[PDB]
Amino acid sequence: KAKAEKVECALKGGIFRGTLPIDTTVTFNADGTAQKVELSPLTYRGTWMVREDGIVELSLVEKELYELIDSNSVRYMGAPGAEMAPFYVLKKT
Amino acid sequence: KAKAEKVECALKGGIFRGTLPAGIDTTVTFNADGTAQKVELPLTYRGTWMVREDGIVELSLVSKELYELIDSNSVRYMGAPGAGKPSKEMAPFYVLKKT
């Protein structure tokens, strides 16, 4: 439970930006909802959930996983069931 | 609700230190399981903590104490219930920094 609620605390209210292999934004609202923006701004809305292993499930509108590197960074891991990791990082803004 | 959660997050797993007026070198640890301890100069205390809807932290020691979260790394000893310390010029001396 410790890991999960630590990830929860670090993310909610936070907006994370980075250019993935497309300038991308991911906002984890504290109400449990989420927003993703891509650049011709494409927009995706939905909710985010945290497992007990720490991973963050994002269901927009099929699932996007996210890992919390540190308090201010998050890595896009791709869909569930999936040395250039730094290019998938999203820094808090 | 939204306020208390931020206060919860910023605190749990955190150990805060400061020299409160007498000055007493003091430690307060907010364990993430809801428990807590205080160390003074070594007088050790033990108990629990929680956050109200106003954002204030109640601390029940054994061997009540109110705390305000200034920033993500600082808390201020306010006093006891019904016995707050609103003195501005005196406020900085009641602060406890995280580490």
Side-chain angles (χ1 to χ4, degrees):
Chain A
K1 164 107 155 178
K3 176 60 174 168
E5 67 185 2
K6 286 176 186 182
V7 170
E8 180 178 344
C9 285
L11 278 167
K12 50 210 306 180
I15 166 164
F16 300 78
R17 189 188 180 189
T19 310
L20 315 184
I22 302 174
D23 204 340
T24 305
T25 284
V26 180
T27 306
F28 304 85
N29 302 320
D31 59 7
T33 70
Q35 174 198 264
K36 187 208 253 192
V37 184
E38 291 179 338
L39 296 177
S40 61
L42 299 194
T43 305
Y44 307 83
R45 314 235 185 238
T47 59
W48 56 283
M49 303 227 297
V50 191
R51 317 171 177 167
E52 215 176 39
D53 70 350
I55 305 302
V56 182
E57 262 173 18
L58 180 42
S59 306
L60 304 156
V61 58
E62 264 254 322
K63 258 190 182 153
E64 297 188 7
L65 306 189
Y66 291 89
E67 183 185 6
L68 186 74
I69 307 171
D70 54 29
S71 301
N72 305 89
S73 306
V74 134
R75 191 189 295 98
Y76 170 77
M77 314 183 71
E83 64 243 308
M84 57 181 294
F87 295 106
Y88 287 97
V89 180
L90 302 160
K91 288 232 159 61
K92 195 173 194 164
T93 69
Chain B
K1 294 180 179 179
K3 177 56 178 178
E5 279 190 21
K6 183 177 181 179
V7 175
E8 273 167 28
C9 293
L11 274 163
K12 52 207 305 177
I15 166 166
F16 299 71
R17 188 192 179 190
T19 304
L20 314 189
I24 307 301
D25 203 339
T26 306
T27 284
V28 178
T29 307
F30 301 88
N31 303 318
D33 53 13
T35 67
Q37 71 169 23
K38 186 204 252 194
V39 188
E40 290 182 352
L41 294 177
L43 293 197
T44 312
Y45 305 82
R46 185 65 173 169
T48 60
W49 66 279
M50 106 299 157
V51 191
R52 322 153 161 177
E53 291 182 350
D54 56 25
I56 305 304
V57 185
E58 276 195 347
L59 196 66
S60 309
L61 282 63
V62 181
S63 191
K64 269 180 166 51
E65 297 182 355
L66 306 188
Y67 292 84
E68 182 186 9
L69 188 70
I70 307 170
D71 51 42
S72 303
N73 306 81
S74 310
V75 296
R76 180 175 66 87
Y77 175 63
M78 302 175 64
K85 300 177 168 293
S87 179
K88 176 199 160 204
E89 59 179 29
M90 199 67 183
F93 299 111
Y94 287 101
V95 180
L96 305 154
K97 292 229 147 59
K98 180 168 163 166
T99 179

